[PDB]
Amino acid sequence: TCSNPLLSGVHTEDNEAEEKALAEYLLNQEVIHPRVAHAIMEASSVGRRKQI
Amino acid sequence: FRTLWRENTEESDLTSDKAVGYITSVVPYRSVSLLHCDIEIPPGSNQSLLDQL
Amino acid sequence: RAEHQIILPESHLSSPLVKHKLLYYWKLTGLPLPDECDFDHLILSRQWKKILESSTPDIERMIKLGRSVHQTLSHSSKLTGILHPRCLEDLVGLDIPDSTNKFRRIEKKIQIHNTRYGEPFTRLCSYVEKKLLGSSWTHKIRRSEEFDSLRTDPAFWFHSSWSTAKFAWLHVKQIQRHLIVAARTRSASNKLVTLSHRSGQVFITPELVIVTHTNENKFTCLSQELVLMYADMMEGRDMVNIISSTAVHLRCLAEKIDDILRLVDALARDLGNQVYDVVALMEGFAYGAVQLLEPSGTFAGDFFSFNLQELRDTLICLLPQRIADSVTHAIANIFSGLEQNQAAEMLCLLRLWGHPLLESRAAAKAVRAQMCAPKMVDFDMILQVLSFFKGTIINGYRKKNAGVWPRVKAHTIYGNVIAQLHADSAEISHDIMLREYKNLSAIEFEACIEYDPVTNLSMFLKDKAIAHPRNNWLASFRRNLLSEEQKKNVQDSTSTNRLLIEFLESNDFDPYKEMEYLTTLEYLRDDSVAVSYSLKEIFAKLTKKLRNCQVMAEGILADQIAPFFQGNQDSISLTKSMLAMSQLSYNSNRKRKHRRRVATFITTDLQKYCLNWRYQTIKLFAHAINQLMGLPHFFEWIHLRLMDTTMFVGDPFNPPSDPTDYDLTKVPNDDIYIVSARGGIEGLCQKLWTMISIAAIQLAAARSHCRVACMVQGDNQVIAVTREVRPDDSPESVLTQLHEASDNFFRELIHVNHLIGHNLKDRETIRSDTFFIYSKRIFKDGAILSQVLKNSSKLVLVSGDLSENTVMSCANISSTVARLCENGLPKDFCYYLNYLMSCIQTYFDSEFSITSSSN
Amino acid sequence: VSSDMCSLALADYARNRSWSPLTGGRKILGVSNPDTIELVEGEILSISGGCSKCDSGDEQFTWFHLPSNIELTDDTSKNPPMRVPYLGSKTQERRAASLAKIAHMSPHVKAALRASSVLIWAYGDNDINWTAALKLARSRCNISSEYLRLLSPLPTAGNLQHMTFTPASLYRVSPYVHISNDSQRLFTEENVVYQQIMLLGLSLIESLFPMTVTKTYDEITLHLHSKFSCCIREAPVAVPFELTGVAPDLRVVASNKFMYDPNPVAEGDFARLDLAIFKSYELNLESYSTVELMNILSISSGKLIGQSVVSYIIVYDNTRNWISEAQNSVRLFEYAALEVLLDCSYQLYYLRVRGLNNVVLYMSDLYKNMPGILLSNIAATISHPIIHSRLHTVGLISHDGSHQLADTDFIELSAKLLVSCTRRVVSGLYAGNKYDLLFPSVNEKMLQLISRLCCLYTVLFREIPKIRGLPAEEKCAMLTEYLLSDEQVDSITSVTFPANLYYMSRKSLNLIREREDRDSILALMF
Amino acid sequence: TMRSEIQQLKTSVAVMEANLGMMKILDPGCANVSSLSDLR
Amino acid sequence: IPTMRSEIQQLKTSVAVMEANLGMMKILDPGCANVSSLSDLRAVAKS
Amino acid sequence: IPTMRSEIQQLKTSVAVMEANLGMMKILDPGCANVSSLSDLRAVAKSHPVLIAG
Amino acid sequence: AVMEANLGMMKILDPGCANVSSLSDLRAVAKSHPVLIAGPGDPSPYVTQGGEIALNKLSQPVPHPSDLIKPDIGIERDTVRALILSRPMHPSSSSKLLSKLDSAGSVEEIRKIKRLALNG
């Protein structure tokens, strides 16, 4: 029920889709680095939604 | 060249039996050809201090 | 059905103790009310006939419990109900064998745990110390004596004094919580559990617990959050007794603690609630027992003698003179002979007799005695503080923006020195602020700071209650207890009045538009602004839009204007800064190659700080910050709003007494009301008042020619006054220069706080050469002074309320055991202590569970 | 696996086997740090023989020393000095004044540059990873790829982040303990592990003295040895590649100030940033030789020494070391002395310090009795035994005026090295030589620095034309007028800007760390 | 002339003492049983 | 005559601070709460 | 210097300002004549905050 | 000028530092001020015929000035036992100080033992 103009896009519906997609892009690679992928997800907009 | 400091300082002061035990544990038995002793003594010390030294 | 088994009733006390909640359920049951409540202002004015006709289950339980108490107890003599805290020593000795039998099973199983696993803990701890400290530090190092007393006495938790009361009150608390969870579901069996204890009976319902002593023909009723308080204090003082009797360097405290624990418990039988005036002094005696160890003649025993003086001067107003002198003698003989660490360990005796019963009438009296009081301030000292205020703003802006002064109105620079410092853009020294204060305080600024209104956003998302506005303010009280003509004005609320939820659900939120509620003075037009003071011993309830502007003003100040001042981080940065500040003590550098820098310390706490600020003092400081922002009228809003409105102490179980109260603009400056408040409310505008106090401390530094390191939050102020001594100087002259600097700065601090209307509690302020006091920790000569017993009094047995979570409870136990080990215990003791207390926890959840309806 | 393997082999086996359905046989790595207790073996020496570890062929340890006869009372007239003990440095986080910088970056820009640096550090440096890093950093800000290729900081440690008042312990004996760390070579980096060892050692030292003790009586040394551990891992090789697949869409709004910076970079940033783009085409530093990189560290560890300490209350010990930067360079203290001379040429000129043997005497005045006493950076630098041995070889440090321990705490020997390097630079400039004046932030500053060199020449090379009170151009014209009224003239009549001095320092330091021929070139200069 | 000089200096002295340091500022707080509409 | 005019100049810069202090004395009254902060304190004192 | 007479034309005039307003300020005498009620604050809020600069 | 013609001094009688009795002393040393009404309200309960205003330690006008006006033997003995028992001291000297302390009988010579205990 968030309706103020500030923090508008914090709750969307493809949040799970973006989160799963970004985690799958970062982790499913040649070498798996979970700490730096956690840092990248934390730095991107998904981590900004989680931190808000 | 080898020093004689096993990180402990009453093995350095020659008014201590631990100095004798440490140095005679390190140095081989009767192998020094030139011993030297450049020690100082404070003025008016204990007589037993000089005895132990 | 099963939804109601989630948000379980809270298992430790986390809310104030309202007296009239207990009084409400006392009269709502059929029992005689206690003796000091015979002329009560809220008991003798309600319509009790209509209340008992409501026939809710809440009232029916109390009626049946009243009949149950009448039937099991004497009819011949006089029924005497006694009120907390006059029943402390009686409930101290509660002894239910029906629950001691339930705890001996846990005791037996944990003695089995020791007898099958105690020696491998010895082998583990000797292993770890042998691996970390080599096999040469092992022929003469063995286990500690705390570990040995833990190893030979596995049931330490079961075999102290206060253990039987701990068993009884934990059992009664768990039965109470079970009864509340059962009474959430509307269908119910008999909700009256009767336990049988030594010379009496205990009656347990979802609203009250009644303890009846039959030989004395007396009884007492305890509300829903008062058995939580008794259970918390019983397991707290039991754990304090355990730790102080097993720790080797603390054994001399244990008997001392027991003596003082019984001493006040006698005094509560005739001081009543006023005995919480005596408990409030106990803190000072600990500080008084540290200041006995000063390295001089001066500053020695002053605050000990002051606390002892105030102790006798409060006891003689109630007790006989011989008894008061003997009690003062016993207090002085308990706190005498304490070591450095022990005298700071005696701060555990703070929350250990529990809490006074609060009521709204006395609290509103104590507020309006200091808030509607007139004040007379001094214009010249205001100009001196304002000159240092603007000088610190100029130095902060010139440090931040690379050597450039802020945008000053050019024709308002007066004098030649300030004109030269302007045209050279230099740093204004404190001497030029003090000498040219008449020309510096008259300076102005222009709009030269870009701000952000919604800077933080972690503060808009707080769960803070919002006082629903002054047309609907009677909905703050329980509708059961309003009168009839007052009950028509209680409207219904489609909101939750929470800052979080109503921040999220407010379309068309613009922060710049919301600041126009203060810049344009529309907040002073509005006739729907209410302020609600809370029953505490810091919290207020504003309306929505006023709370929004308050949070915005705090964001604007802590963003930009606040970090200009060196007085106000991180728990490592604080233990670096305060530790280095204590490195400057006399004793830390008594090795008497430039001038050595030494210091002596002043910890003060101003008398009634937040509500002695008036508009007339803060307006020029707020005016400076307004001109610096370009805002017409922003930061002086609090006094101008509180002058135009009246406010009330909000509490459900404390309605207004006189039932003819409709409008706030008509009620007298009486029962719960405060009309035209002049002071400020704590936490609101805290940054501005902090900054004004930093300006006053630097002014008192400059007026006595001393350099000062100050750390101040709100009313807690810690000052190191400094001195630069030569290596060829005697220690007597070092102490002499330090004490003259201390007395000179202390006189000037008293003086500059007096002329702007602030007492320091100037004989409660603690001057010392050795220690200072910050955030209830004592810093003495570069060592932090230990508080194991405070952390032992929080070694409790249920954590969290969201379920019967055992894992989070064991996690709380482990974090408090680590917090003990940091204050200095043996390591092996704390490790095996956590093992035993986790075992106590995990057997305490199989029994004593309030929802087992398989393990 | 079994019970008797070191715990990180077991934890890596557990992570691999537990994620094996999702992962499919690949090795989850970059995660495990060893247990601090299982890592080290300790030894305490108090009154007798030394550590049986270091007697048995061990070399690598940390060293903790508590003195004797320490009172824990208010009678404290025989104690050792009391300093603020080691609390633990996270990284001692600096404000972002980075490798190309903007003073007022919004936190979204910080998050974007953090993401770009971490991504390039982990997965390599090529076009695919910069495409992915651009795609991810668009979700927080609105900058182009050319800004990410330079504003992104150098990859050091930046994956770290994710109470009222609780002190970490009592501090009774830990303010007195001497910590030293210089006998650890593979566990001493920029790293978490030696921070853990330094905290464990202080907690063991304070564990030795229970609360019933007010007096220590002996000296105590810890060796925390960390060499023959079963948890000794070899640092693996990060082999770069390209991120297979495309980075996802990551939609974002321009409305949320809390989630998105719409316009970070401004016009006063536009000009100097795209001039740095233009000049950043000479950053082919991998193609350069190693000795030229050592020249870059000579002018780069230099020319900062002499800017912090020449500008022309609770004091801490929060000091730089310069202890690995000089361990790799080839004389940087020469450029330190040159920076101090070029800074102080104003007061050299206004006192009219003439001739050869008065400039060095005025520098001896300013160095020997500097009114500031905080030379503690070089005093912490040159006390290192390798650096002290190098300066005793070539660099002209004096012989010590006491025993080598108590030689004025090295806060005054650094002034002696400054005097020696100052006269070496003055004798070099008199003798027809110059120095490679790599002066960054590239005009006001160019004619300024030429006026500095001409002012040094003017006081070093009749009546001196007083240029006091003038603007810069009249000063430059009158000094060039006065000098050209007679090799040395070639020095009078006459470098670049790849990037700023800190980037040329750190990048070259790391590239010299990347070389393999560094040992033989170290042995070439003894 | 110097005749108005000492007059202006003594009037400025009377301002500098009588307006400046000798000036105290009173908030008459409402320490009395009254309503808000009474004070309005 | 320089000792004439220096007295006059310091009377200017020490009389102007009295208007600057009377404006401050005016705005401490809660009546003058509409007098916005962006106003010259001399000109507040003169009206 | 004939300028200073005109500056007297400033200074005395400014003194004629000060005694103009110091008789208008609510100096407390024994008797409590010129006391102010709360409602004046209430009367000030009803308009926007004004500027008395120049 | 007319600077002293209207600024009626109002005889402010601050306690400030000292707080001794006898209002004669407070009437004597009391610098006079031109107080200025700023806040809304009625100060007539706080002024007095004679033109005087008595302030508190919180700079509060109090209606009748005698509220400011408003020794022990046991507290001194207890504090000096606290000093003797609590400070570091040789045991025989501490016992001999403790012996001749119950023999005291006035506030005088408790102070002698106090300045003999801190300085001994």
Asked if C684 contacts C550 with a C-beta cutoff of 8 angstroms, the reply is yes
Task: Give me the half-sphere count of Cα atoms (radius 13 Å) on the Cβ side of residue H89.
Answer: 22
User: What is the C-alpha separation between D138 and D112, in angstroms, rounded?
Assistant: 8
Whether A41 has its CB under 8 Å from any CB of chain D: the answer is no
Contacts with C633 from chain G: Cβ below 8 Å: 49
- Say whether the A–C interface has 3 or more Cβ pairs within 8 Å: yes
Partner-chain contact C377 H118, CB within 8 Å: no
* Subunits with 3+ C-beta pairs closer than 8 A to H: C, D, E, F, G
Report CA-CA distances (Å) from A26 to A34, D15, D89, D136, D241.
8, 18, 30, 11, 13
**Residue A21: enclosing H or E segment and its boundaries?**
helix A15-27
Q: How many residues does chain A have?
A: 52
Separation in Å, CA of G12 to nearest CA in chain E: 9
User: What is the C-alpha separation between D472 and D475, in angstroms, rounded?
Assistant: 5
Which of E10, E37, E40 is the best mutation test for G, with the most CBs of G within 10 A?
E40
Asked if C634 contacts C701 with a C-beta cutoff of 8 angstroms, the reply is no
Asked if C268 contacts C354 with a C-beta cutoff of 8 angstroms, the reply is no
* C644 vs G38, G48, G49: nearest CB: G38
Whether G34 has its CB under 8 Å from any CB of chain F: the answer is no
Asked if D191 contacts D235 with a C-beta cutoff of 8 angstroms, the reply is no
Contacts with D76 from chain C: Cβ below 8 Å: 587-588, 590, 781
User: What is the C-alpha separation between C568 and C692, in angstroms, rounded?
Assistant: 12
- What is the Cα D33 distance to its own chain's centre? 24
Asked if C206 contacts C191 with a C-beta cutoff of 8 angstroms, the reply is yes
Separation in Å, CA of C646 to nearest CA in chain H: 15
Task: Give me the half-sphere count of Cα atoms (radius 13 Å) on the Cβ side of residue C773.
Answer: 22
**Residue C197: enclosing H or E segment and its boundaries?**
strand C193-197
Contacts of C716 (CB under 8 A, 6+ apart): C603, C605, C774, C775
Partner-chain contact A3 C457, CB within 8 Å: no
Which of C445, C516, C524 is the best mutation test for G, with the most CBs of G within 10 A?
C524
Asked if D277 contacts D145 with a C-beta cutoff of 8 angstroms, the reply is no
User: What is the C-alpha separation between C719 and C701, in angstroms, rounded?
Assistant: 10
Contacts with H88 from chain D: Cβ below 8 Å: 73-75
In A, minimum Cα distance to C511 occurs at A6
Separation in Å, CA of H53 to nearest CA in chain F: 20
Q: How many residues does chain C have?
A: 855
Residue with tokens 């970090």: C563
Partner-chain contact C521 G42, CB within 8 Å: no
- SS3 string, D469-497, reads CCCHHHHHHHHHHHHCCCCHHHHHHCCCC
User: What is the C-alpha separation between D47 and B12, in angstroms, rounded?
Assistant: 11
SS3 of residue D512 by DSSP: helix
Q: What is the DSSP string of C729-767?
A: --HHHHHHHHHHHHHHHHHHHHHHHHHTT----TTTSEE
Task: Give me the half-sphere count of Cα atoms (radius 13 Å) on the Cβ side of residue D11.
Answer: 11
A to D CB pairs, distance under 8 Å: 111
As beta bridge partners, residue C475 has: none
Residue with tokens 């240092």: C388
C814's tokens? 């482990």
Contacts of D471 (CB under 8 A, 6+ apart): none
Asked if C374 contacts H60 with a C-beta cutoff of 8 angstroms, the reply is yes
User: What is the C-alpha separation between C236 and C12, in angstroms, rounded?
Assistant: 11
SS3 of residue D14 by DSSP: helix
Contacts of C432 (CB under 8 A, 6+ apart): C391, C417, C418, C421, C440
Helical packing angle, D413-430 and D332-350, nearest 10°: 80
* G49 vs F34, F44, F47: nearest CB: F34
**Amino acid at residue number C328:** T
As beta bridge partners, residue D492 has: none
* Subunits with 3+ C-beta pairs closer than 8 A to G: C, E, F, H
Contacts of D28 (CB under 8 A, 6+ apart): A32, A34, D12, D15, D16, D19
User: What is the C-alpha separation between C770 and C600, in angstroms, rounded?
Assistant: 7
Report CA-CA distances (Å) from D278 to C129, D32, D100, D457.
62, 43, 13, 34
Whether E36 has its CB under 8 Å from any CB of chain C: the answer is yes
As beta bridge partners, residue C209 has: C204, C222
Nearest one of C659, C645, C221, C643 to C477, comparing CA atoms: C659
Asked if D459 contacts D346 with a C-beta cutoff of 8 angstroms, the reply is no
Contacts of D115 (CB under 8 A, 6+ apart): A39, A40, A43, A44, D133, D136, D137, D140
Contacts of C266 (CB under 8 A, 6+ apart): C89
Cβ atoms within 10 Å, residue A8: 15
Asked if G26 contacts H36 with a C-beta cutoff of 8 angstroms, the reply is yes
Nearest one of D430, D434, D423, D452 to D333, comparing CA atoms: D423
Sheet of C532-534, strand order = C540-541, C532-534, C646-650, C673-675
Separation in Å, CA of C820 to nearest CA in chain D: 10
Asked if D172 contacts D72 with a C-beta cutoff of 8 angstroms, the reply is yes
Partner-chain contact D212 C823, CB within 8 Å: no
Contacts with H38 from chain F: Cβ below 8 Å: 28-30
Separation in Å, CA of D207 to nearest CA in chain C: 8
CA distance between the termini of chain F: 35
Whether D73 has its CB under 8 Å from any CB of chain H: the answer is yes
Sign, Cα dihedral of C2, C6, C12, C18 = negative
User: What is the C-alpha separation between C202 and C172, in angstroms, rounded?
Assistant: 9
Question: Residues of C3-27 as b/e, b for ≥16 C-beta within 10 angstroms?
Answer: eeeeebbebbbeebbbbbbbbbbbb
Helical packing angle, C615-629 and C686-702, nearest 10°: 100
In chain B, the largest separation of any two C-alpha atoms, in whole Å, equals: 36
Asked if C688 contacts C615 with a C-beta cutoff of 8 angstroms, the reply is no
User: What is the C-alpha separation between D48 and C15, in angstroms, rounded?
Assistant: 60
Partner-chain contact E39 G42, CB within 8 Å: no
In chain E, the largest separation of any two C-alpha atoms, in whole Å, equals: 61
E strands, C37-140, are 80-81
In chain H, the largest separation of any two C-alpha atoms, in whole Å, equals: 77
Q: What angle do CA C94, C99, C105 make, to 5 degrees?
A: 135
Q: How many residues does chain E have?
A: 40
Q: What angle do CA D43, D47, D53 make, to 5 degrees?
A: 25
In G, minimum Cα distance to H49 occurs at G30
Whether E19 has its CB under 8 Å from any CB of chain G: the answer is yes
- Burial of residue G13 (CB within 10 Å: 0-12, 13-18, 19+) is exposed
**What are the φ/ψ torsions at residue C767 (nearest 5 degrees)?**
-95, 145
User: What is the C-alpha separation between C199 and C366, in angstroms, rounded?
Assistant: 41
**Residue C548: enclosing H or E segment and its boundaries?**
helix C544-556
Asked if F26 contacts C448 with a C-beta cutoff of 8 angstroms, the reply is no
Task: Give me the half-sphere count of Cα atoms (radius 13 Å) on the Cβ side of residue D423.
Answer: 16
- What is the Cα D3 distance to its own chain's centre? 42
Residue with tokens 């400290």: C133
Partner-chain contact G41 C644, CB within 8 Å: yes
Nearest one of C173, C304, C321 to C235, comparing CA atoms: C173
Partner-chain contact G8 E39, CB within 8 Å: no
**Amino acid at residue number A44:** S
Cβ atoms within 10 Å, residue F42: 21
* Subunits with 3+ C-beta pairs closer than 8 A to F: C, E, G, H
**Experimentally determined by:** cryo-EM
Nearest one of C710, C450, C460 to C561, comparing CA atoms: C450
Residue with tokens 């040649």: A30
Q: What is the DSSP string of D430-453?
A: HTT-----------HHHHHHHHHH
CA distance between the termini of chain D: 48
User: What is the C-alpha separation between C789 and C795, in angstroms, rounded?
Assistant: 10
**Amino acid at residue number C656:** P
Q: What is the DSSP string of H46-102?
A: T-BTTTBB---TTS---SSTHHHH---SHHHHHHHHHHHHHS---HHHHHHHHHHHH
As beta bridge partners, residue C471 has: none
**Amino acid at residue number C267:** L
CA distance between the termini of chain B: 26
- What is the Cα C551 distance to its own chain's centre? 22
Q: DSSP code of D203?
A: H
Report CA-CA distances (Å) from D191 to D160, D187, D188, D195, D384.
11, 8, 7, 7, 20
Query: Breaks in chain B follow which residues, C to N over 2.5 Å?
Result: none
Q: What angle do CA D322, D327, D329 make, to 5 degrees?
A: 100
Q: DSSP code of C45?
A: G
Interface list for A 9-28 with D (CB within 8 A): 9-10, 12, 14, 18, 21-22, 25, 28
Report CA-CA distances (Å) from C803 to C158, C740, C848, D357.
26, 60, 14, 85
- What is the Cα G50 distance to its own chain's centre? 16
Helix%, strand%, coil% for chain G, nearest 5: 50, 0, 50
User: What is the C-alpha separation between B4 and B35, in angstroms, rounded?
Assistant: 14
* C757 vs H58, H75, H85: nearest CB: H58
In E, minimum Cα distance to C368 occurs at E31
C126's tokens? 């000797």
SS3 of residue C386 by DSSP: helix
- Burial of residue C442 (CB within 10 Å: 0-12, 13-18, 19+) is buried
Peptide bond into C85 cis (omega under 30): yes
**What are the φ/ψ torsions at residue C179 (nearest 5 degrees)?**
-70, -35
- SS3 string, D152-164, reads CCCCCCCCCCCCC
Asked if D207 contacts D64 with a C-beta cutoff of 8 angstroms, the reply is no
* Subunits with 3+ C-beta pairs closer than 8 A to A: C, D
Q: What is the DSSP string of D142-198?
A: ---HHHHHHHSPP-SS----------SS--SSGGG-EEE-TT-SSS----HHHHHHH
Contacts of C38 (CB under 8 A, 6+ apart): none
Whether A2 has its CB under 8 Å from any CB of chain C: the answer is yes
Partner-chain contact G17 F46, CB within 8 Å: yes
**Amino acid at residue number C313:** D
Report CA-CA distances (Å) from D202 to B6, D72, D208, D223, D459.
22, 17, 10, 12, 55
Separation in Å, CA of E27 to nearest CA in chain H: 4
Sign, Cα dihedral of C316, C319, C324, C328 = negative
In H, minimum Cα distance to C373 occurs at H60
User: What is the C-alpha separation between C591 and D77, in angstroms, rounded?
Assistant: 6
| Overall resolution, Å | 3.4
User: What is the C-alpha separation between C430 and C384, in angstroms, rounded?
Assistant: 11
